[PDB]
């Protein structure tokens, strides 16, 4: 059943199917510890296709990959490609499909990772499509929630920053859609979280607060996701340094924050938390990276049938 | 011997007196969780007369006489007794004693309780009488500090706000007398406590330090005992206007306080303790509520002769 | 092989010798709490010479000879011998040998325990020469670092203030060569740490950084040293008014700092350590001063060949 599924939307999956992935991440966690190299993948290939940068999706892959015994072909650049010959997406998708049995694309167009799907008779795993979605960095941040809470529900989840062009908030608010939570989207208002987004998960019945001000919130935060404002992804320069560098943690703000505030960040991070944070029992950023090479391991073993 | 006694003022009790309530108090209160209803009241009813507002110390009576297994009448508005037709305390007390088998009175005038006392066969306990005495409130505080510092003595208590018109800590310095303990008296200098308590106290050598900046002390302190501007006690509303929010405890003030210090307030409170000191391990002023039933089921029971 | 040896600079030392002073010093401490009285120094003489004033050196010296069992002779003022009538230093150390068995002297200039060393047959102990060395301050420096932290290196250590005429940590900075820590000079320019001694740390491969800011190393420190300003050693008032006041540690410094943290102080302290640091954890300066007797009594002992 798992076998040959695709990983879009997270809206493709439910409470059960996250469930899954999480716990058979960390199965796949401690069995790496005790053998150091498993076989669930001898024979299949990964076709990683970046036509965009990354340093963390990429390499957690190819990683767990290897973890899993199989083997990696792909491109960072698709400069380096055919594309730059002026081939399209579908034709690559396509002609890439036929020589591995699984691939991970992260594209710069909304809907590539659909549009590959759809064309492709391999299993595709969206590694970010434009500002859309983030299937994988979601779960992997479910993963380390639950694993630092010791459990989902019960939470009082803070997402703040670019919550308009972060495909992994946009992602991330939907999954918690399946828990009991109370989420507080904070973020100046030329960044908040696409209207359609909220209004669901409030049409589902969720306590989801949209502010301006973080300390408003941040005494009753269990977790606070920091997002990096993609520069990338906006209209013009111009459009960018109108909301350049306005919000930041730091001490100082964390001077109203709970002892167990935990605060995560899928990163990269530019200056929207100050490295002071990074020896104070708050962060955990880092050790969300770590959570990635096992999640991704159970969906590569999944998606590929092998597990 | 505790059969008829009244509760008037804290200068009546001895340190063996209060010892019992707070040890009979940790009785009633296993007790109860145990048994879930106790009969020591039946048959005995509580007449609880207010003429003026009140949450906490009615409520907690009634409740601890119901606890207990007696019966209550009363009434929370005076304008709905006779003495709206004109009828005087004294009055009031004598007809009313014949109905019930102990008083729990709280007047604007101060004496009042002593009034009633005089002019009643029934025991009469002192729920707060003008600005002058409040012993029951003193006597949960007690419960509380001995509850949360295991112990007496050997604390540092600092008395923070309206000490003037704060007729919870009138009470609450004058029981300290019988402890060893550093008392603070932080406050406007036109709201001091009555000079006469203070000399008292130095009368029999305690050590009391009367200062107006809060953070002059509050480094040393165990515990920070927080009251409300009595503005109904004032001469009029400008007396009141001069000294209008002119002290406050939240996390700013908190930052050169000991770990271990420990946050009172007899409540309600308006603004004096900002409601962010509310879930740091500091606020236990809730927790204080909770002893108000086992400290008034001990003095009922007392009082009433059923234990 | 210790009996007869000096101890002039730290520099005259090895790990192994600093080592074993600080493994007899804890040795000497338990045995005091068992017998209450040791024998080792009975029959000797210690004999303290103070040409400066002193609390802590003078005090714990002749404490440490006490607890040994010795006797102890000397001169907290050098105006009441006769180098009032004009007597030289040489002349009064080869004078003073010939009544005990043990030295230990404070003169303000440079070099004065070398020449002291130099003519006495009798071990010499050098309590501060001028602005240069301070052994015995060190060799209980590192004692309550490694009693504190446990252990010796893996330590990022803080020296801040006078680093200039601190004798205190001329000599600590040199012990440390033994050591894998990194070293963070803080101080005005006006107060940097001999050029010729930070060199030489490096030129052995430690990681000596030298700033201005305190804050900018605070958040790494597992220690931090603390010193007073000696203004009696500068050429003048106006050469210590430029100077004056300009560091201290308070809560508000520390609140960048590790929860880890510990602060000390050769003492006496002026306002370099604003008093509520005190009851903080960090605060270690007053059982830096505890830890000086077992020390002083290893030294004392080692050096007398009684142990
Ligand atoms: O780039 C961000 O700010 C968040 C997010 N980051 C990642 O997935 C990590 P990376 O780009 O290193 O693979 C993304 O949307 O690509
Ligand atoms: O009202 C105050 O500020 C303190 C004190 N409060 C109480 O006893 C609690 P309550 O008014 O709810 O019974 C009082 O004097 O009545
Ligand atoms: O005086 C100082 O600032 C540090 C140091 N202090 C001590 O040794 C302690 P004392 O002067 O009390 O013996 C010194 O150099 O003499």
């Known amino acids: 059943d798992w076998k040959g599924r695709d990983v879009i939307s997270i809206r493709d999956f439910s409470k059960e199917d996250i469930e899954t992935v999480l716990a058979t991440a960390e199965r796949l966690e401690r069995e790496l510890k005790e053998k150091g190299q498993l076989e669930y993948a001898k024979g299949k290939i990964l076709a990683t296709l970046f036509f965009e940068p990354s340093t963390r999706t990429r390499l957690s892959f190819e990683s767990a990959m290897h973890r899993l015994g199989g083997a990696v072909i792909g491109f960072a650049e698709a400069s380096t490609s055919s594309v730059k010959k002026g081939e399209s997406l579908r034709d690559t998708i396509k002609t890439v499909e036929q020589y591995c049995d699984v691939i991970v694309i992260r594209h710069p167009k909304e809907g590539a990772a659909?549009?590959?799907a759809e064309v492709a008779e391999v299993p595709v795993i969206n590694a970010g499509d434009g500002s859309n979605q983030h299937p994988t960095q979601t779960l992997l941040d479910l993963?380390?929630?639950?694993?630092?809470?010791?459990?989902?529900?019960?939470?009082?989840?803070?997402?703040?920053?670019?919550?308009?062009?972060?495909?992994?908030?946009h992602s991330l608010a939907e999954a918690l859609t399946f828990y009991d939570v109370e989420?507080?989207?904070?973020?100046?208002?030329?960044?908040?979280?696409?209207?359609?987004?909220?209004?669901?998960?409030?049409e589902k019945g969720m306590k989801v607060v949209e502010?301006?001000?973080?300390?408003?919130?941040?005494?009753?935060?269990?977790?606070?996701?920091?997002?990096?404002?993609?520069?990338?992804?906006?209209?013009?320069?111009?459009?960018?340094?109108?909301?350049?560098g306005s919000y930041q943690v730091n001490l100082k703000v964390l001077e109203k924050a709970k002892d167990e505030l935990r605060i995560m960040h899928p990163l990269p991070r530019v200056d929207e938390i100050h490295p002071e944070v990074d020896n104070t029992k708050h962060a955990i950023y880092f050790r969300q990276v770590f959570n990635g090479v096992p999640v991704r391991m159970a969906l590569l073993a999944l998606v590929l049938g092998v597990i």
């Open 143 to 169: 993963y380390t929630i639950k694993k630092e809470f010791g459990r989902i529900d019960g939470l009082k989840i803070g997402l703040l920053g670019d919550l308009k062009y972060g495909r992994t908030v």
């Open 183 to 202: 989420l507080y989207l904070i973020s100046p208002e030329l960044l908040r979280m696409p209207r359609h987004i909220v209004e669901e998960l409030r």
């Open 211 to 244: 502010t301006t001000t973080l300390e408003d919130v941040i005494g009753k935060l269990d977790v606070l996701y920091v997002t990096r404002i993609q520069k990338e992804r906006f209209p013009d320069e111009q459009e960018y340094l109108k909301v350049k």
């Open 114 to 116: 659909r549009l590959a």
